[PDB]
Design a protein around this ligand. Sequence first.
Ligand code: ZN
Ligand code: ZN
Ligand code: ZN
Ligand code: ZN
Lengths: 133, 127, 127, 133
Amino acid sequence: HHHMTHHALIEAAKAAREKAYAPYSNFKVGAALVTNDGKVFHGCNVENASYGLCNCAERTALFSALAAGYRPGEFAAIAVVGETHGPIAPCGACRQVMIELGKPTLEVVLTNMQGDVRVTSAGDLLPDAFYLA
Amino acid sequence: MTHHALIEAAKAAREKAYAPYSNFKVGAALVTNDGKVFHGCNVENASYGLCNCAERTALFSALAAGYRPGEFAAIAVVGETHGPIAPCGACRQVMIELGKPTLEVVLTNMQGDVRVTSAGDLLPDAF
Amino acid sequence: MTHHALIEAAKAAREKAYAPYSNFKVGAALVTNDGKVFHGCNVENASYGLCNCAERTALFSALAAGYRPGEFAAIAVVGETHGPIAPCGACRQVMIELGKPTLEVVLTNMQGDVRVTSAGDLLPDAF
Amino acid sequence: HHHMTHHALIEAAKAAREKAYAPYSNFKVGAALVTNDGKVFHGCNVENASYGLCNCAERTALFSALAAGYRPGEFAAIAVVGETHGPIAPCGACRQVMIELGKPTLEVVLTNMQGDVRVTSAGDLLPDAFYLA
Ligand SMILES: [Zn+2]
Ligand SMILES: [Zn+2]
Ligand SMILES: [Zn+2]
Ligand SMILES: [Zn+2]
């Protein structure tokens, strides 16, 4: 992502977060996903009165990109942001989807609303991940 | 926008599906009240419970773009089913909250069979 | 087994719920055709999409014990709702597959309001 | 779990696996959970024609124990088994539920149908896990 800095991707993730639908938790999360050809996809959490139907920002971004014709392995990086003490931690469900759609080498930029950043990978977030060949 | 145009959009959406486990591609096309179209496709996962449906993919995308619950006109859904495709209960629960009971739902298949219903009709006495 | 007894079992099940996020406890009691009762409660998670409902907890438990789809007589569901509690679309999708459309569903609240329905009625033209 | 060996817990997980409802994947998984007072709960995967409603063995076992009145932190160990090359890897969704219900220190015994075993913890499976305080 020669033309996409971590700062720019975090800024897009914060912009994504503003569109969240989270009236149940009141906990807004944003994600921004940048593809192999430099296209950026926003994701936010989208809640439901039946909590089990809630969808996370990371997954919203990835599903949106897939719907646009991007395929597993076509993503350069994803940034995720929430109002947390440290850089936001993706949930396990998001990690499983990130590893399948982004591959273990997907760069994951985690941040909060206070300038705290850590850079990791989908593989590092989910060691010895489950696969079905 | 015609129902035919929306169905065609859903068919186009379907082509972009990721369904290596079921080998069963589904498409959806959601139109907003102001005329914007959002494509949705099913996106599967090795952990089956993490699979996402076309209808939900389209709705989540529209929310991510800044649309709010109740700002949608209709959704078309298509797969290679015998009759018009039947949305699963999970999709129905999401459609009713984000689309409202009055959301028009256009169900179809790859053979031209069509049924029109609403989010409310699909999920009687909803949560 | 009486409907009253099944409802009381669902109330007992409800007490064991893990719902610190919604603070809203739900119970279910599933009775098999040979008369065994399985309790279910909702079990929430910090990642909301991973929350499991009472209805599903009871059905999954019965499957894990060795019961097969279609081997169930009825399920009761209870929460502190205004009228009888309404099962979500996700539960309806699971109930129709594991219980079959003819599965009797007894919906109730903490005030004595009851409605009896079926898995098929709750999910018209199911997937 | 003084009276429950890893071997005994694995044997219970294999017995659990036999009861799986997996006509879609044809991939049966079993789990066995042992509580603080030595009670054992079986779990198996339970599939649905709409794949997003499938439930995993690990989660089936934990939800069953919760329904019996066991609470977060009341679990000593969980064994998980499937027909895999190495010890079966729990999916990310299961890891998120295991960490909340079992706590980071929950002992996780992973195995297959060919005698391969590894012992880990819920925390090790899900580093820097997501929580809501
Ligand atoms: Zn997540
Ligand atoms: Zn669906
Ligand atoms: Zn439910
Ligand atoms: Zn799992």
